[PDB]
Amino acid sequence: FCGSMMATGKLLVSYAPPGADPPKKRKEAMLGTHVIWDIGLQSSCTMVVPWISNTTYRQT
Amino acid sequence: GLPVMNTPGSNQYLTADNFQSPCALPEFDVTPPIDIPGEVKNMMELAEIDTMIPFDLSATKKNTMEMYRVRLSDKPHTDDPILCLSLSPASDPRLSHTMLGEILNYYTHWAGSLKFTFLFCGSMMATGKLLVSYAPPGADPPKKRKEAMLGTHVIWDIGLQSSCTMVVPWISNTTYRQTIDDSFTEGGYISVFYQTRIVVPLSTPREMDILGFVSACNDFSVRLLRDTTHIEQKA
Amino acid sequence: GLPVMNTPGSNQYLTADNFQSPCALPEFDVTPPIDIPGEVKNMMELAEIDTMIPFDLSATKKNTMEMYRVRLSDKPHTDDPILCLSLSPASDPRLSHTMLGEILNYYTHWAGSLKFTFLFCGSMMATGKLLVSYAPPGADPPKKRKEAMLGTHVIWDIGLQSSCTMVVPWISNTTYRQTIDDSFTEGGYISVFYQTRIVVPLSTPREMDILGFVSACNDFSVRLLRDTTHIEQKA
Amino acid sequence: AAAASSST
Amino acid sequence: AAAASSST
Amino acid sequence: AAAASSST
Amino acid sequence: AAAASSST
Amino acid sequence: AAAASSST
Amino acid sequence: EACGYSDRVLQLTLGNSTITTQEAANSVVAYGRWPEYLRDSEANPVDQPTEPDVAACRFYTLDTVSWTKESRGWWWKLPDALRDMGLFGQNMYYHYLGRSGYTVHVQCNASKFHQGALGVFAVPEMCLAGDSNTTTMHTSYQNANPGEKGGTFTGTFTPDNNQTSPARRFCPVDYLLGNGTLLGNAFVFPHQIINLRTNNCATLVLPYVNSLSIDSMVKHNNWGIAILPLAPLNFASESSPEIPITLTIAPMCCEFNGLRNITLPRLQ
Amino acid sequence: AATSRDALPNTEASGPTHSKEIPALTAVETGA
Amino acid sequence: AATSRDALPNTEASGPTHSKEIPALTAVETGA
Amino acid sequence: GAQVSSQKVGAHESTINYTTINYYRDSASNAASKQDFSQDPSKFTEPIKDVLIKTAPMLN
Amino acid sequence: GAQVSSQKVGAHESTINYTTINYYRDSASNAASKQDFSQDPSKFTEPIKDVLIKTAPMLN
Numbered sequence A: 001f002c003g004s005m006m007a008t009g010k011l012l013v014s015y016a017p018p019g020a021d022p023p024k025k026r027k028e029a030m031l032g033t034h035v036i037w038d039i040g041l042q043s044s045c046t047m048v049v050p051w052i053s054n055t056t057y058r059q060t
Numbered sequence B, C: 001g002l003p004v005m006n007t008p009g010s011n012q013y014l015t016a017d018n019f020q021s022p023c024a025l026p027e028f029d030v031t032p033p034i035d036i037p038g039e040v041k042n043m044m045e046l047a048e049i050d051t052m053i054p055f056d057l058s059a060t061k062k063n064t065m066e067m068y069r070v071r072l073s074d075k076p077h078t079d080d081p082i083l084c085l086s087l088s089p090a091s092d093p094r095l096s097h098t099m100l101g102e103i104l105n106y107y108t109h110w111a112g113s114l115k116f117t118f119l120f121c122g123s124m125m126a127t128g129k130l131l132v133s134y135a136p137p138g139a140d141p142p143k144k145r146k147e148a149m150l151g152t153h154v155i156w157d158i159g160l161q162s163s164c165t166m167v168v169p170w171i172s173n174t175t176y177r178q179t180i181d182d183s184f185t186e187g188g189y190i191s192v193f194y195q196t197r198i199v200v201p202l203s204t205p206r207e208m209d210i211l212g213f214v215s216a217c218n219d220f221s222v223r224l225l226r227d228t229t230h231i232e233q234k235a
Numbered sequence D, E, F, G, H: 001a002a003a004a005s006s007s008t
Numbered sequence I: 001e002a003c004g005y006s007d008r009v010l011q012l013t014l015g016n017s018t019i020t021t022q023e024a025a026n027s028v029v030a031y032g033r034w035p036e037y038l039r040d041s042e043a044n045p046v047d048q049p050t051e052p053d054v055a056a057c058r059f060y061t062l063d064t065v066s067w068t069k070e071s072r073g074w075w076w077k078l079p080d081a082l083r084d085m086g087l088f089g090q091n092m093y094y095h096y097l098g099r100s101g102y103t104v105h106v107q108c109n110a111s112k113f114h115q116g117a118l119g120v121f122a123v124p125e126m127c128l129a130g131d132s133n134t135t136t137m138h139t140s141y142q143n144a145n146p147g148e149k150g151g152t153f154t155g156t157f158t159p160d161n162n163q164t165s166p167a168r169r170f171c172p173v174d175y176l177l178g179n180g181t182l183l184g185n186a187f188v189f190p191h192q193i194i195n196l197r198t199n200n201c202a203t204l205v206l207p208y209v210n211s212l213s214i215d216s217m218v219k220h221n222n223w224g225i226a227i228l229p230l231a232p233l234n235f236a237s238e239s240s241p242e243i244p245i246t247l248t249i250a251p252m253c254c255e256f257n258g259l260r261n262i263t264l265p266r267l268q
Numbered sequence J, K: 001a002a003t004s005r006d007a008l009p010n011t012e013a014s015g016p017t018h019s020k021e022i023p024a025l026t027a028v029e030t031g032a
Numbered sequence L, M: 001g002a003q004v005s006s007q008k009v010g011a012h013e014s015t016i017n018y019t020t021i022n023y024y025r026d027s028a029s030n031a032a033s034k035q036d037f038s039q040d041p042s043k044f045t046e047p048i049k050d051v052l053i054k055t056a057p058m059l060n
């Protein structure tokens, strides 16, 4: 987050494994893998996208 | 005399009390017991015995021998119910006068698992598969095999072992249910269906009867003794 | 029979008595307890919990959410009171309906130390120092910081720790006080003042609220159980 | 007590 | 007393 | 009890 | 008696 | 009983 | 902590969901009891329970509501507010019986120049009062269970009078906690306060509470979540400030008994 | 030795089955 | 001692969390 | 001659006891003890000459 | 089966006792003993996940 120190906010970062309608609304996005990021002193937030695959390797 | 102070309850007569009292025939020579067969120690022993369910209380069949017979036939497969029953062992008209139902009407509360056994009374040449279901309360009461299938059930295959038992497991929110029709303590739905169909050869009867029995499991109990509504003395 | 002599009190019914009596449902199968969360053993446990004081029972504010809010402002220093309160935990209108006040109206007598906690609900940019006072009874009730200062007090500095607690120590002639307005067992005066003043920067609200809570200390007790006046059944 | 009470 | 008084 | 019962 | 009469 | 019956 | 750690900064993870907060005021565990599964000694239904675990015991975010100078308060019931939430709602409607605990995370951030205080209360058996003065205990199931969107408090009791065709709904006056008791005493219930100068979230861990080990989740709500403005929203000098409040809730140690066909409730 | 007020039997945990034991099938003609 | 063809680290099982350890929050300004 | 027995305690406020003394010579005067025994239903539920094993075919 | 306990003596004229005997089989018939236990209010007054030290900052 590169806003000012006086700016606050909560954001949600999502990952949805394939196979359904790609999320277009927080409601859908919420149902999969996610992190609710709270903006504050720790400037940054990390979301891990876990290896979730049918195949052992994916194509590039 | 010893100083005493009468407390409340004094001189009253509680019909459920348990005190001593003077004997009117002192030193009476009591006739001893002999060892009569068939002694009972608890009313629940009687509830554990199978008794026949009057499934068909339809207007022309009720209060007659016909009420005990569920007629089946070799007709083509259908997903419609052979019979539907509410699990209200004391209040449902079909269970209320069975020995289990009768004992339950002397008590306010019941709890435990029940078991329904069905007997096929068709000919040896008749075959068939039926499905016996129990649906815990709270959804649409089953009207089609498809719904009924989703709950507790047994697929009965007709053969040498004449009969089949389905256990209705104790599944309740409350620790005890009431012996009356009551939504808060509703028990669910029993229903029977054709899995495949009854099949007979030629020269064989195409219709036949099944009979049903209910009894209590060893985990069944009752409490709060009460008067029954199954007898009265109008005047 | 054993010679006995009935003493006075015989056949009476004291509602506070403690005797045995015959059971109307013998051998009833009692449903066991489960471990429900939140068990209480003594009513004083509830008195030790903080509940919000309706400080402003002014005519337009009473019986509304506003009664709980003590409004402050960034106005210049004054030695005049923000609020004044009598230490009559059961009878003063501001304390009488708090959970402490409510429990106290089921008892005739109280004793122990109390504690008032105040919460500042202004913005983080607002600063200020306030003085919270307790004056034991017997003199002119404080109307100016100068008087209030001379008794038991706490100077509260507003900052990260949002709230401040002042303890009102048990200071009494009698061993217990009455749960009613009464001069012989009067408890004194609680009052709040501005030590310096509330200061805000620009672009900041100049008025804000504080909230107050009361709870009992571990040395607090009550006695002589009685009916409350906080409920009735006219007809 | 022994004595407590006589018994029969 | 010992005997108690029977106990169950 | 022995003493507690005095007896006569 | 000893046993039970319990005492507290 | 011994104890519990206190005596004075 | 000399190596960094603090009361105000938490990370909660349940299932595939993680919440972070840098401005908490600790966490509350209701009555000091952490959610748990039903013990054999306390068990009642004899059938093998369904335990959805990560599929249902994760964080569901409900619809964000908006706090303003005129807001009087909001309420929700559990499990009702989660009845349509993914695999939790499905397991709920397929079974006769169910039990669950919850982690409730209320989210409301603002700025160093705003002010205001929200009281967040978890009430066991939160029976609310109806809108009628001619009949009692008459709010309809549909009106009593708003689902995820919840309901709201009013500052004024205004009695439904259409006697011919009654509203049949709650009329919860804020200073009476919608139930005839004074709001100032709701602090005897498990709670937290979101005071904008101090914190931006409230976190409550709620055990399963009831007079039964397990019950009908469709018929009965175990907990009520009540959020009321203890001190009104205020900012700089704007007469109409607004800030969002978001509710995220996670079922915890939830288990279900009595499987059958799905319950299709008439909710309108 | 079992008394009228002793607790009833505990339910025991049981899992899936695929065997020749047939508890469910019986013959009431026997009188049992 | 780790060679280019050694297998990579195993994923370890991990459960629910409610604590003050904050893996997810960081500050990339540090250069890490 | 006092008889001490224990109560099966329902809702609680060690084992609790109660005391009984018979005042009359005739046992018919005695109250009911309620200290009763249970039996198993076999003689009614399974009166068959050959013992039944529930997992095996009732008829073989 | 008698039960002997001591009275917490208020205004005085060794420990003084009183005696109780249960006459009924059902524990519901029993009087109330009033021999009750106290608990500490923690679960209501301090339901917080992290133990609080009163001399230290509630928030740190």
Ligand SMILES: *C(=O)CCCCCCCCCCCCC
Pocket (backbone or CB within 6 Å): D005, E004, E005, L001, L002, L021, L022, L023, L024
């Ligand atoms: C066994 O009973 C020895 C202890 C006796 C205890 C006192 C009995 C109380 C009075 C009983 C008198 C009997 C009346 C027929």
Ligand SMILES: *C(=O)CCCCCCCCCCCCC
Pocket (backbone or CB within 6 Å): E005, G004, G005, L002, L004, L018, L019, L020, L021, M001, M002, M021, M022, M023, M024
């Ligand atoms: C334990 O109780 C042994 C001592 C008995 C003392 C005498 C009891 C007084 C009469 C009690 C009769 C009980 C009435 C149901």
